[PDB]
């Protein structure tokens, strides 16, 4: 998964490092956390901080 991921649930962000995203949406994760808890996703809208569980690689 070079940069192809997808959210399992609908995540909401308050503008902070996080990015309001819906469920079942495909995002490009090009960033991770030192502990592996957070996941930096990126899409046509831009970048965003999505949880490590709420998100998951696309169907390959």
């Amino acid at each position: 998964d070079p940069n192809l991921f997808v959210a399992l649930y609908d995540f909401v962000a308050s503008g902070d490092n996080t990015l309001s995203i819906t469920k079942g949406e495909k995002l490009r994760v090009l960033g991770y956390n030192h502990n592996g808890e957070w996941c930096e996703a990126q899409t046509k809208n831009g970048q965003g901080w999505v949880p490590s569980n709420y998100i998951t690689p696309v169907n390959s």
Binding site: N17, H34, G36, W38, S52, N53
Partner: protein, 109 residues
């Protein structure tokens, strides 16, 4: 006041060096990304304990009641005890007997 971001190790010591007991401050670790450190000017020696802190500002939420993949909360953790954030952490070190005597106030004023 006590939250020092981007504080170099050499800087901390240079600040606490010769500083009476009770002076303490948090600083980002050099060889530890997204990790805080508790600084305390001991008796002619400045100690620095390693602390863990969440990366992004947003707090990561939990997964469904089902099996959680790579479950790793963003809460604060230090030694054999955890905390809600740095504020609570610093308070602990000040209330506990970690280093020489208890803490008094942060390097700031």
């Amino acid at each position: 006041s006590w939250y020092w971001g981007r504080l170099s190790r050499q800087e901390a010591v240079a600040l606490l060096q010769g500083q009476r007991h009770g002076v303490f401050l948090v600083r980002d670790s050099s060889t530890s990304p997204g990790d805080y450190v508790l600084s305390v000017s001991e008796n002619s020696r400045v100690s620095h304990y390693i602390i863990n802190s969440s990366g992004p500002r947003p707090p990561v939420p939990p997964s469904p009641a089902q099996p959680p993949p790579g479950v790793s909360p963003s809460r604060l953790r230090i030694g054999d005890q955890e905390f809600d954030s740095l504020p609570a952490l610093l308070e602990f070190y000040k209330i506990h007997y970690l280093d020489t005597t208890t803490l008094i106030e942060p390097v700031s004023r």
